[PDB]
């Protein structure tokens, strides 16, 4: 006789999906919701270019290394790619104290202005002239030192005096800065450079204090140098004074940074393109709309949520049981 | 099927049917086809779509990794952010895994529910009037006209109408 | 409705029937009415509830944030601190969420399905006594007494004792 | 039960039918027992099964506390290790407490679905030729010999053979 | 024409709503909201405890002894601690609370501190602790003060500063919490004329501790008309620990300390009243009297309070879809 | 009579319960238990490599060379650590160990020591070697000792204490973990006597470290019968860099050091006071071995090794059977 029947629906779909009941489920429509695909480059995020320190270190970059000159002026970034194998850093020996704390307050900014904090003359009766290290080439000059700081030394006469500095921040911005304190091997090399008797660096701010005198003595060799450099940043907030105070050993600030404040540092191998993106992440580019992601957990912009998941593909179509011709 | 219908008493699908997950088939001296039922199919589609939509947005939540330093002397505070971001980073693996294979099972279920349901909504109405050959299909006793395969998909099946028709020729034999 | 039931082959409800979830709507020459089945309401109430005391119990520890103070040589820590922190608020807010996403749609379903065995419940005692119409409803072929319904309820319904008269109008 | 199967139109469970999650139970003028569905308790055992080894292996990450001494100069990062650990402790607590309950409810329905859908195969295929008692049990209008009841059980069960026996017998009554 | 027992369900002029995975808007019978969205603008007490207010002073204004703290000098005892955001007596003589973060949690719970003379001026012989005051510190009543928990020590007007010693072995049952300092002049002629000539120490130590600094001497910008620093210390005498002090000039010496009685404790830096009310949870913006399984007010509190979540609203239906006529 | 078939389902003797979100208690053909929370109160070899038991020293008496902690001296191999938690023999001459936390983390998380002569007592010209030795360090058999792995150096007869340098390359494959010290005597007398007069220092450095520190010469309260203090310090010396020693004078010097290797696997200290027998473990847990197939436990949080994620569940009951409705006998 006359038949109705009742059924569903079946196409060619070889798509499955899995469950907690069944896995290898074929069925009729589905979606995916994770990308594993990534361009393997860097691009510009917010229509803002990367910072690519080459062939420095950010040790070498905003310290001042004589070979990082191409990065010299101010700087606008959207992130930060580090080639890992980066030859040109802290040239001359010794550890730049708080390096981690200052790795990450660089990576919060966007944009540093360079100025010149403290000009030469600000130190009367000493040498700004004649510090600069062997171990501190340029490309072009076999000796030279950081553009940044001075090794003042001093002056034919016999006396090194008590130098002192001050600088205002009147700006609106706050201001990075960098110093350091000489340790030469012997009393031979302490002599020469700086006067007789008990040296000092000093320097002070509202909500700072610092104070060293040099330690003497012979490290090993690093750059055919056995004497050390200790470094020190920190940051003159708006409205905040430094006051400089040294009868020697000072490696003083010259030039410093008004600083302006998520952001990234990616150390990395990748080609940086004439290309946007809207999702960068540490291995690649996310062009993408899914909703998660197992490229990387390090990104900056609008990424994917980060999983270890292979596939994370929903069903929203029926068990696909097609007629078998 | 855990309903049974799908993969179960209504062994296979309709290829044939393009116009919607679920449907009639009818056959009668007119014709025959395949008719998708509009309304069970659209929702159903609102409703997948709005679990899908549910579930990114639910998830549009990023943990966010960081590049951090550590010293020869921050040994323990660098596994702290280690074990840290791996942590959430293993609770949101599963809470995907394990939400995908959740909801497809019960996505699955929810389609048998949506045949069975209209398998059972012309059932109760043929009556005896019809006669229930296998896989959810229905010998008429009667002659059925493209207006009678319309009344019973939208309802208005008329059972008195075929009554009489129906009985002298179920017992005929 | 999922069981087909509930927004389905039972298209409303019933502003009337006031003293449960599930019920009865009669009609007689004595009159109609409302009323519920207490068994499958007190048992559904009380599941419903246990549900949403497993919730709450499951629910009842807190993350504790803490607002220390971190310095200028802290900026790490300070940030993995809130990191940290919005990552298991990011995680509750999300378990919360969905949770009662999932159990709002199985809660519905429930009250469906209890509807469904409600109706089968009674359709399996009436037999070829009754007929079923679409709509959850049964059109009784004989005269139902108020103590023929309450018994339908009660699920103490006597089919041979309507059976002979109901064959008649059956097919008179 | 939710499908009503369960401790629900069916009372009771059986102590005798020993091999299988749902059965049938015959009596016979040739003898009386117990036997498994065998289709369908090995699909449940399959499904079940699957559901265990799913939530095991979504489970195979832990996450790690670590004893590491702190002094006490160190007393914020301590507490940030604590208040750390204990998240996850209380994540995980609650992912697993939650599920176990979950999965549980919905595993009783599935069980309780295969009962209800074992029932409703064999109430299709006997029509009138069976009357109903209660409990999920058929009494049949005609005979049934051992080879009428296996067809029953395997889903092959001959209608119009026995129509015209169980139409006499019923009339009788 | 027929009697009718027809099988239904509830309705109810219900019109609140929830959501599931598959519809939005679903209008429900009978539902629970689980979460709490209104607070009591106020501070209550905790436990039937009141609550600490700082007031005008600052954490570091109350401990230290600032002269202008003066009411809440003593004995206290709190719940929780509210210092006010625009606080303004905090350290009155420039200088850097060293460990200042690890203080505040340390102090932060703590539930009462009681009071007491550590080292009386009898100590310290041969110099002078009655000359200590200074304009930086003033008292509402006085011009030159100093901080009431400290004694600032100066050479006596025939000279000069004497090898001076204290100790103190803790007998008791609660661990002592102090404080010092060491002074930090702005010349040479300040560092002579207070204390002697010479190479000046502070030392001080216990079974568990060492502490060794000396002046470092030089000139800071002007904060309080003030030039010279102050760097001071806490610390923690634990119950059987002896602490011994030792000085040849430039310590700020302990007077003053605080028996300490350390569950989970709150310091609340906000502008809220302090009403004479009870509470069962406390919130950093307001009061939760609620039964409520979440909130969505704030992630800090103290008592036993909801869970935080951002959720505007969380709600289980419990009834069913309501389909009224 | 007339022919019946049911439709049916199992059941058994079954008493095990289950919880569900709508109903508790309720009793199920099958399920599975997914929790453990059995436990073998004991520390267990775990790659068949035996765990190092401190037994009565602590960690620092261990690379110090604590003179009492000689069973332990030598080269040592380890699956992890086991410290007692009232062992007595630890920093005999009082003082701080600095960064202790950062070293404890580093010595766990390491396999294996092999103990050397990095600095030999002839590297230091011009003062005595042999006079050191305390009574706050006495071995077993001597009464007046010192740790086995520091010189504390101190003056000759002739008034003055001269320059003393020493240099150790390491020209090899492995870090090496080193100990130092400076003095810090009560007195200026027992300065003056035991160093020479005038300012002192111990200055130290790498092509990457930089130390110096003067002592601080203060009375501080008596332990172990001394007044004293001596600042304890470590590093590790990278393979292919160089360490210099220089001191003026209060320098404890190094004596011996160790060769350190660093794992690949999880390292782990437990301070526990459980006992180590002769068994192997895949699990072992701070308060026991876990010997277990399930997928949770509720023993410890704190583990080496393949182990159950820990949860506070007391337990975990998955249903995998139906709800056991059995018949009623009487
Ligand atoms: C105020 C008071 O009475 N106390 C001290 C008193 O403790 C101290 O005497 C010290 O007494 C202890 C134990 O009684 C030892 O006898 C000290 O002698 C030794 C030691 O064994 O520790 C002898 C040893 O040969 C010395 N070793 C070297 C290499 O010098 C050491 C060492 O000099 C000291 O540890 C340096 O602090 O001491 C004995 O010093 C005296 C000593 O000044 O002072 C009292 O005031
Ligand atoms: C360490 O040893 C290497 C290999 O002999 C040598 O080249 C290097 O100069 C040594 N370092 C120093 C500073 O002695
Ligand atoms: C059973 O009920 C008891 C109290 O009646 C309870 O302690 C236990 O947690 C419940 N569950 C199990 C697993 O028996
Ligand atoms: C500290 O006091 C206790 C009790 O008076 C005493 O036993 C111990 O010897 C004292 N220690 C010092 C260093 O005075």
């Given at each position: ?8 629906h ?316 | ?16 049917m393009?116009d919607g997950w679920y449907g ?12 998708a039922d509009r309304?069970?199919t ?132």
């Open positions: 006789g006359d038949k109705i029947c009742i059924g569903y079946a196409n060619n779909s070889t798509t499955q999906v899995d469950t907690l009941l069944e896995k290898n489920v074929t069925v009729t429509h589905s979606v995916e919701l994770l990308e594993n695909q990534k361009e393997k480059r860097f691009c510009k995020i917010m229509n803002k270019a990367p910072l690519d320190l080459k062939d420095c270190t950010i040790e070498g970059w905003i310290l001042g290394n004589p070979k990082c000159d191409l990065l010299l002026g101010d700087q606008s970034w959207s992130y930060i790619v580090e080639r890992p194998n980066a030859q040109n850093g802290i040239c001359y020996p010794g550890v730049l104290n708080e390096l981690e704390e200052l790795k990450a307050f660089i990576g919060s900014g966007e944009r540093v202005e360079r100025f010149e904090m403290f000009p030469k003359s600000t130190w009367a009766g000493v040498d700004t002239s004649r510090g600069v290290t062997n171990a501190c080439p340029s490309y072009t000059i076999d000796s030279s030192f950081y553009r940044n700081l001075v090794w003042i030394v001093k002056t034919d006469s016999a006396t090194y005096p008590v130098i002192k500095g001050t600088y205002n921040n009147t700006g609106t911005q706050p201001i990075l800065y960098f110093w350091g304190v000489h340790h030469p091997l012997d009393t031979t090399v302490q002599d020469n450079l700086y006067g007789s008797g008990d040296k000092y660096v000093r320097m002070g701010t509202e909500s700072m204090n610092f104070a060293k005198s040099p330690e003497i003595a012979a490290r090993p060799a690093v750059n055919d140098q056995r004497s050390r450099i200790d470094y020190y940043w920190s940051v003159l907030r708006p409205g905040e004074t430094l006051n400089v105070e040294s009868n020697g050993n000072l490696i003083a600030p010259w030039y410093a940074y008004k600083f302006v404040s998520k952001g990234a540092v990616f150390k990395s191998d990748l080609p940086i393109e004439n290309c946007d993106a809207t999702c960068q992440t540490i291995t690649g580019v996310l062009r993408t709309n899914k909703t998660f992601q197992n490229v990387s957990p390090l990104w900056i912009g609008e990424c994917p949520k980060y999983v270890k998941s292979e596939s994370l593909r929903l069903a929203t179509g029926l068990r696909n049981v097609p007629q078998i011709a | 099927g855990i309903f049974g219908a799908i993969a179960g008493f209504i062994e296979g699908g309709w290829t044939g393009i009639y088939h009818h056959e009668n001296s007119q014709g025959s086809g395949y008719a309304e069970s659209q929702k159903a589609i609102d409703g997948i779509t709005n679990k899908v939509n549910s579930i990114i947005n639910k998830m549009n939540t990023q943990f966010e990794a960081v590049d951090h330093e550590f010293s020869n002397l921050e040994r323990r505070i660098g596994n702290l952010n280690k074990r840290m971001e791996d942590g959430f980073l293993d609770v949101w693996t599963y809470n995907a895994e394990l939400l995908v294979l959740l909801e497809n099972e019960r996505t699955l279920d929810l389609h048998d529910a949506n045949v069975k349901n209209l398998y059972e909504k012309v059932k109760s109405q043929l009556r005896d009037n019809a006669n229930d050959l296998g896989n959810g299909c229905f010998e008429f006793w009667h002659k059925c006209d493209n207006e009678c395969m319309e009344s019973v998909k939208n309802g208005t099946y008329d059972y008195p109408k075929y009554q009489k028709e129906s009985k002298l020729n179920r017992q005929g034999i």
